[PDB]
């Protein structure tokens with residue numbers, strides 16, 4: 001019943017069906033582990049197929065307080081209230097939850113996207129206007145018997161996946177689940193201890209990988225890297241792929257790269273390995289990212305004599321973001337109860353006949369350094 005409860009469009013997030021209000025109003029809601037506010041369109045907008053109509057809900061309560069949330073991409077403002085909320089293809093429960101009713105927005109809603117709101121699944125510490133605004137998942141756990149854990153299987157124009165609330169579905173992964181500690185409960189903050197491209201260590205002090213934090217963020221498309229790390233990674237991927245020369249704009253995500261249909265030279269692009277801090281001192285495991293993940297297909301019938309891609313690795317001034325292109329093809333367990341994130345190869349894993357995405361360990365390092373930036 002919870003399997004295949006996510007849909008989406010490539011590059012535009014993954015969403016789950018929800019209802020708000022009494023009687024229930026059905027909305028599609030983007031699943032975002034990178035923020036902590038539940039917010040829904042609540043006024044007409046050119047890109048909204050539908051919106052929350054507070055006047056039609058008998059259970060709506062105005063909190064008489066406005067709220068503004070600026071993401072990396074897009075921003076919105078709205079009015080806080082509470083109302084009853086369900087998830088038709090999740091646990092059969094009804095929870096009263098905080099809801100920001102979006103009345104104004106800028107570059108938030110996406111033309112043709114199919115979602116009308118966002119579900120911030122991270123912790124209260126980053127909720128706006130402040131941490132007293134209890135996030136949705138906290139309310140769900142407090143009000144029901146749902147275990148304090150959820151798991152995401154994001155699959156690679158239309159895409160799909162599963163959000164399993166309150167548990168782990170073993171049919172969605174193979175091999176072992178490897179856990180990395182949640183360093184601080186605000187974002188889902190983790191620690192990267194090593195980065196390799198084409199098996200070659202980037203050779204930086206490991207704190208650079210976590211400047212100034214590293215997070216797991218289903219609401220962000222790309223792998224985003226601190227400038228120093230980004231520049232080193234791009235240099236190494238360029239070197240690996242030097243049999244072909246792409247315009248500088250491709251590497252900056254400003255331009256597509258296109259090949260005749262069916263002829264994408266996957267083999268010239270390297271595998272990227274991200275080593276995550278283990279649960280035991282100086283131990284780690286790695287997740288390996290194939291080019292089928294970090295070259296994001298851009299669907300466009302106009303260009304359809306070709307396969308065209310955007311480089312889905314980009315620069316960040318706010319730390320590492322392991323976004324959707326990293327999560328796709330892994331089964332990712334947000335084990336809040338035990339303050340850890342689990343990774344396993346998912347049933348929808350990425351692979352060709354030569355290489356496959358992997359989650360593998362353990363690895364040991366002799367270096368005693370804490371890789372946390374703070």
Ligand SMILES: CCc1cn2c3c(cc(C(=O)N[C@@H](Cc4ccccc4)[C@H](O)CNCc4cccc(C(F)(F)F)c4)cc13)N(C)S(=O)(=O)CC2
Pocket residue numbers: 011012013030032034035036069070071072073074107108118126127217219220221222223224314323
């Ligand atoms: C999913 C649309 C999309 C496409 N991109 C990008 C993008 C960043 C976001 C992003 O900011 N995602 C938000 C949620 C979201 C926003 C707009 C549309 C859909 C989803 C995440 O919440 C960001 N998580 C970290 C963060 C940053 C600032 C403030 C907050 C907080 F906590 F909400 F205040 C969280 C979405 C997106 N990048 C700039 S990018 O490098 O991945 C390339 C393109």
